[PDB]
Amino acid sequence: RAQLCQPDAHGVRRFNGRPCASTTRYVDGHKGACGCGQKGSDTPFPWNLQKHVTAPSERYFDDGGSNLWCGKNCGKCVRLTPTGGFVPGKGGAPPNHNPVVFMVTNACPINGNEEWCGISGKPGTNHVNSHGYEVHFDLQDQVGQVEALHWDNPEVTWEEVPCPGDLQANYQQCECHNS
Ligand SMILES: OC[C@H]1O[C@@H](O[C@H]2[C@H](O)[C@@H](O)[C@H](O)O[C@@H]2CO)[C@H](O)[C@@H](O)[C@@H]1O
Ligand SMILES: OC[C@H]1O[C@@H](O[C@H]2[C@H](O)[C@@H](O)[C@H](O)O[C@@H]2CO)[C@H](O)[C@@H](O)[C@@H]1O
């Protein structure tokens, strides 16, 4: 069993009573679904390609909704802590379990991402993806910021946390701030 989070009675994978999430990495160069780039143009701000930012699965992104622009959870931060687990054939165990904080700046839509982001309700409603996780975080890797962590799709526990000051200040430039 490479996945260390065990399903509960409802099928939701947990680790010592904390919910788990799956993770992947992505590179696409788009401004993204929280508007973190110049208005009207598909150009991200450089920090939104460089920093620890994420595209969560759609129903978390919009807190149960289906909006893919200025989702309800744009600008939230999440702390992801590796468990040591991974989905066999689709990841590996990381070299350490240091936790990393990421800011939500984009979305992973169900459409075209069914395996990982195809979750039909928000966290707390017992809906899971095809690997048993209630939420998925796709991690921006344009400049190798995830490669530098040596994260290959690790299984993590997840929690919402207050954003660090530099990420808060970055988010204030995004079009979806105060939308
Ligand atoms: O659909 C989510 C996300 O997947 C990323 O690809 C995964 C792939 O699904 C998995 O089989 C392999 O082990 O890992 C890669 C990298 O995490 C893809 O890069 C993203 O564009 C996509 O949003
Ligand atoms: O890039 C601006 C554009 O973002 C759209 O969200 C995309 C995002 O670009 C892409 O990186 C991610 O994989 O998928 C999301 C959702 O499709 C957003 O929906 C548009 O409104 C926006 O103009």
Task: Please describe what this structure looks like.
With 179 residues, the protein is α+β, with helices and mostly antiparallel strands. It has a single domain (1-179), classed as Barwin-like endoglucanases (Beta Barrel), CATH 2.40.40.10. It contains four helices and eight strands; from the N terminus they run βββαβαββαββα. The chain has helices spanning 47-50, 58-61, 114-117, 165-171; strands at 6-7, 13-15, 18-26, 53-56, 77-82, 100-104, 136-140, 156-161. A six-stranded mixed beta barrel has the order 3-7-4-6-5-8. A hairpin with a 2-residue loop joins strand 2 and strand 3. It is globular, with a radius of gyration of 15 Å. The site of a molecule of 2 linked components (BGC-BGC) has 11 residues, from strand 3 and helix 3.
Topology:
Elements: E1 6-7, E2 13-15, E3 18-26, H1 47-50, E4 53-56, H2 58-61, E5 77-82, E6 100-104, H3 114-117, E7 136-140, E8 156-161, H4 165-171
Parallel strand pairs: 3-7, 4-6
Antiparallel strand pairs: 1-2, 2-3, 3-8, 4-7, 5-6, 5-8
A molecule of 2 linked components (BGC-BGC) binds at residues 24-26, 90-91, 108, 113, 116-117, 138, 153.
Examine the secondary-structure arrangement and name the CATH architecture: Beta Barrel
- Under CATH, the homologous superfamily reads RlpA-like domain
Give a short account of the largest sheet.
6 strands, mixed, barrel
- Report the order of strands and helices: EEEHEHEEHEEH
What is the CATH T-level topology? Barwin-like endoglucanases
Rg on CA atoms, Å: 15 Å
Q: Give the strand content.
A: 15-25%
Name of the level-1 CATH class: Mainly Beta
List all distinct small molecules, including ions and cofactors, that are bound in this structure.
Answer: a molecule of 2 linked components (BGC-BGC)
Outline, from the CA principal axes? globular
Query: Termini, distance in Å?
Result: 44 Å
Number of domains: 1
Helix content: 10-25%
PDB class: hydrolase
Keywords: Cellulase, Glycoside Hydrolase Family 45, hydrolase
Assembly: monomeric
Entry title: Crystal structure of GH45 endoglucanase EG27II at pH8.0, in complex with cellobiose
